Design a protein around this ligand. Sequence first.
Ligand SMILES: Cc1cc2nc3c(=O)[nH]c(=O)nc-3n(C[C@H](O)[C@H](O)[C@H](O)COP(=O)(O)OP(=O)(O)OC[C@H]3O[C@@H](n4cnc5c(N)ncnc54)[C@H](O)[C@@H]3O)c2cc1C
Length: 518
Amino acid sequence: TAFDYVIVGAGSAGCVLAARLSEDPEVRVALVEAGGADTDRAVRIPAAAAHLFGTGYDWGYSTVPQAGLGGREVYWPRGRTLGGSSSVNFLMWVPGHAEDYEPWARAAGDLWSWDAVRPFLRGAEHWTGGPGAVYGTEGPLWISPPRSPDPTTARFLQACGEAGLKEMTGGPGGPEHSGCALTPLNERNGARWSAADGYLRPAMDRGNLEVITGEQVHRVLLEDGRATGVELAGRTLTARREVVLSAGTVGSAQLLMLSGIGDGPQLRAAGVEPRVQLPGVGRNLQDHVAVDVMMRATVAVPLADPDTPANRELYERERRGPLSSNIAEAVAFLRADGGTGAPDLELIWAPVADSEAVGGQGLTIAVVLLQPDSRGGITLAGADPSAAPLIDPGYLGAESDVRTLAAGVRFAERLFAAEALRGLVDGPAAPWPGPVGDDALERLVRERASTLFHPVGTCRMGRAGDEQAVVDPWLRVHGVEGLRVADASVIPRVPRGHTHAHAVMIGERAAELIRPAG
Ligand SMILES: Cc1cc2nc3c(=O)[nH]c(=O)nc-3n(C[C@H](O)[C@H](O)[C@H](O)COP(=O)(O)OP(=O)(O)OC[C@H]3O[C@@H](n4cnc5c(N)ncnc54)[C@H](O)[C@@H]3O)c2cc1C
């Protein structure tokens, strides 16, 4: 079946692009998604998101053994349903810092400066909270303050205050380089509001949009230097105008390589026929890494066991109580060196502990390396389109990353030692060992660090002439006509924020690049 545009992947970016491109009734748009409809309860309920790990809603990737982590493999959940990862994520809308775009503008020009992207980002947002927030007030994605924050969360913010991190008046993504805040949420009335909710669903009555679920794309079909369609298991979808890969940091890169687009020698070694030499495909992989500082609680921890009759009754009646929590209720930003300037550390407050020793009754500060120097890549394991690719982030390959995380763990410890928090905790929650000496701390970081689910950069944007660029500033794959990538893969440098915002923004930006308004 024949379309004008074939979009692969109904995720953060792909939902936006399907909705936007189908706004013109004279173009026919296909949105092709490996997963099914987002129908399960645990998709809707903020507190339930982590229960989707290892389910049909999750691709369930893992990294290769990581030398920087002592040989550990790291689990890589990815959403596999309408809305993609926006349907399984932790609902945090934490859109990053204006300076994050300096390396994008360096790579791809003023099209990708902050001034250019800002309206697209603000345009995605509909803030439901108090005035003075930085967020937009008219976009498809409802952004809300928490309905029922844990009582300890105010204490975390007070502790931050005591340690010189003041509360941000606009929320994260404001002018303040340093500070703390309640997490802005992708929630409407206490339930998830995903890209499928905000963008896709309103568009699905359109006669010119076909949403095709349950279909993993195997490769892009190339003919005479142009993408002509995509191959599913049993049939081909044709595109008269463009194929747009929105399959994310894993899937977009894997699909390029499976199509013969990438480094010819490596593709040959994986059993794939090279078609377009583009060595940057799968390279420049970046991700946030976090270490959880977990303490045993001396107070009630509702989020340790949120799914109870009482909480279900309150959620049903009022959409309040623990089930309305995304768990990661507050954030703080700082520099390891204590300077002014853009943050290189984030602290995430979760009033729970992943610790069986205390039955979950603990409190966590996740310490986040926002600007890793480590880099990795994704390659094919072989030519089977159903096989997972080989994911090697190179976590903690750079020793500076270890030192930065060590500094952040010291700061988290400082917070738990603060007047506002120390009364709430009594020792560490195993397997967090609590305070250790300097050398021990470096080893502990390597033993405990894990993904924070923000992988980017495998289909990096850049100007013609930049040998490891994958797409151009208009998101067109270099050396192919009628083929674009629009998702988190194109990001040159991992931001100082959580990447759902960036993916949505790229979706919006891509739609305007492909079909300018007016
Ligand atoms: C568990 C988890 C928690 C997270 N928490 C947050 C958070 O709270 N806040 C935040 O800002 N970010 C968070 N993130 C990250 C954020 O959700 C992602 O970075 C963002 O959604 C990526 O958008 P995307 O469009 O690039 O890809 P995705 O949204 O992953 O979309 C890719 C889509 O393509 C589909 N696909 C892939 N390959 C194929 C194929 N071959 N054929 C067909 N379809 C295919 C996938 O199934 C998926 O639906 C989280 C991520 C995860 C996994």
